[PDB]
Amino acid sequence: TWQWVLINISEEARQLIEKAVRAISKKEGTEVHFEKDDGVLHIRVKNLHEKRAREIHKVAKLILEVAAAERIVRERPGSNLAKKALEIILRAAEELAKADVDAALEAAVRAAEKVVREQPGSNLAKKALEIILRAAEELAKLPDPEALKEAVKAAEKVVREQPGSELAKKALEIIERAAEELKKSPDPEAQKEAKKAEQKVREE
Amino acid sequence: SSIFLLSNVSEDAAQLAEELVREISKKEGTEVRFEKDDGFLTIEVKNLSEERLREIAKALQLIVDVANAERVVRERPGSNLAKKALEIILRAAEELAKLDLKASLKAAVRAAEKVVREQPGSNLAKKALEIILRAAEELAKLPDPEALKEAVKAAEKVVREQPGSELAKKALEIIERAAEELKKSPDPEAQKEAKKAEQKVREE
Numbered sequence: 001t002w003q004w005v006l007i008n009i010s011e012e013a014r015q016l017i018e019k020a021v022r023a024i025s026k027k028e029g030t031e032v033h034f035e036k037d038d039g040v041l042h043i044r045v046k047n048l049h050e051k052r053a054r055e056i057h058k059v060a061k062l063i064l065e066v067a068a069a070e071r072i073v074r075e076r077p078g079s080n081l082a083k084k085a086l087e088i089i090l091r092a093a094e095e096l097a098k099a100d101v102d103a104a105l106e107a108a109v110r111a112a113e114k115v116v117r118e119q120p121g122s123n124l125a126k127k128a129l130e131i132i133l134r135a136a137e138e139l140a141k142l143p144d145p146e147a148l149k150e151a152v153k154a155a156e157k158v159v160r161e162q163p164g165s166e167l168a169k170k171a172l173e174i175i176e177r178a179a180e181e182l183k184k185s186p187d188p189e190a191q192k193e194a195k196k197a198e199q200k201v202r203e204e
Numbered sequence: 205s206s207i208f209l210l211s212n213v214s215e216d217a218a219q220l221a222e223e224l225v226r227e228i229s230k231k232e233g234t235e236v237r238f239e240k241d242d243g244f245l246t247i248e249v250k251n252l253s254e255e256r257l258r259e260i261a262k263a264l265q266l267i268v269d270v271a272n273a274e275r276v277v278r279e280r281p282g283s284n285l286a287k288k289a290l291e292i293i294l295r296a297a298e299e300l301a302k303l304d305l306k307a308s309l310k311a312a313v314r315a316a317e318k319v320v321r322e323q324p325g326s327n328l329a330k331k332a333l334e335i336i337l338r339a340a341e342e343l344a345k346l347p348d349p350e351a352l353k354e355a356v357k358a359a360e361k362v363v364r365e366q367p368g369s370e371l372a373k374k375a376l377e378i379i380e381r382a383a384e385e386l387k388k389s390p391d392p393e394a395q396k397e398a399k400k401a402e403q404k405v406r407e408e
Contacts, residue, residue: 003206005261008213008268040261057207061241064211068243071212 002048004060006041012110013067014041019103020059021045028052059104062092066111073118086115086124090131097135102147105135109154116161126167129158133167133174140178145190151178152197159204172201206257208247210264216314217271218245224263224307225249228256263308269296270315277322290319290328294335301339306351312339313358320365333362333371337378344382349394355382356401363408376405 004021006014018034021043025032033044045053069088072081089111097108112128112135119125132154139151155171155178162168175197182194210221222238225247229236232252239246249257273289273296280286293315300312316332316339323329336358343355359375359382366372379401386398 001205003257005206005208005257007208007210007261007264008272009209009211013211038262038265040265042261060209061246064209064244065242067211071243 002045002053002056004043004045004056006043008039009041009064010067013063016063016103016107016110017041017060018043019106020063020101021056023101023103024052024056024059055099055101059096059099059101059107062096062104063107065092066096066107070111070114073114082118083124086118089115090124090127093128093131094134097131097138100138102139102142102144102150105139105142105147106150108132108135109139109150113157116157120161125161129161129165129167133158133171136171136174140174140181145182145185145187148178148182149190149193151175152193156200163204172204176201206249206252208245208249208260208264210245210247210268211243213245213268213271217267220307220311221245221247221264221267224267224305224311225260227305227307228260228263232256263300263303263305266296266300267311269293270300270311274315274318277318281322286322287328290322293319294328294332297332297335298338301335301342304342304346306343306346306348306354309339309343309346309351310354312336313343313354317358317361320361324365329365330371333365336362337371337374340375340378340382344378344385347385349386349389349391352382352386352389353394353397355379356386356397360401360404363404367408372408376408380405 006017009017018041022032025045025048028048030045030047035042066089069085072085093108093111096104096111099105109132112131115128116125136151136154139147139154142148152175155174158171159168179194179197182190182197185191208225210218213221218240225236229249229252234252235250237248249260270293273292276289277286297312297315300308300315303309313336316335319332320329340355340358343351343358346352356379359378362375363372383398383401383405386394389395
């Protein structure tokens, strides 16, 4: 039995940790219980082995490390220190993108997006776009529809930031391959997003 | 089993957090581990009751409630937003003063002393000094040498700030009770500071 108590955690980090724990626990076929008391998030997991619990701790560390470095950047420190913190974000986003969890891949996307928005057209912005594309490739492999909807949205940010780049070409392939998988779903909302995705690749 | 994730806290808040979890753990004789993890504190407690776990949660939530409000005080000094943060610091310090632990009481003394420093002579300082005396009274009842030393220093702070007040008379009563227990300590340094405190009680 395992329990995680999140105190003074930002909502972005909390929800990504909620989805990461719920994902890793379904892998071992275990139920998860969440409750929010006085701004404290209690995550209780039952019958979880050490291997999956250590995987929860690694993903939770990286998400909090990204949030800790984003807090320094948003404090407008020295530009030299801010650059050092953006490299910390990209380092944790790289490992978050090397994990099978959907929430970890979604965390690597949102982490690398803030680096692109912080310094557009920089060497780190290009490395951040590599992280966004690395996460979109693993996110398109996953079967869930929500993962496919984030794989297209993430790849669309690569073609928006660097149109005509080498990364944008692969991002368009990811959008096409993910939209074809979305066409398999009978739900009209999945078919709608697949058509707008196909129309975006047709427009470019 | 239980992992506490604490983010966006200073070094002083983290040190008070570690000692508080260690003290609540001895009530059940459990095992606790800490990790500093660059920007967020990780606390793992094994085989602890859910009540004790939720006592750690509310105590750590009060500590970060003080740390977050202090951050506002040190950034917009003199604003009406600072006056609101000082009332939040006192509201959390009052609840920490009711908790009968050395770390929880030290956190209430340091917090309320920060309100005395920011708003001298105001009604907030008077409410803060009452919390300092409430925590000093609980510290004197604790059977620990360092807790008795802190009760003397906290109540001596009250007589230094507003002397000849109704609170200064109550402070001298607390100083006397703590010094009477300090003289029973075999520690020579405790014997020395107990006489210095009892000498200050004869005066005023």
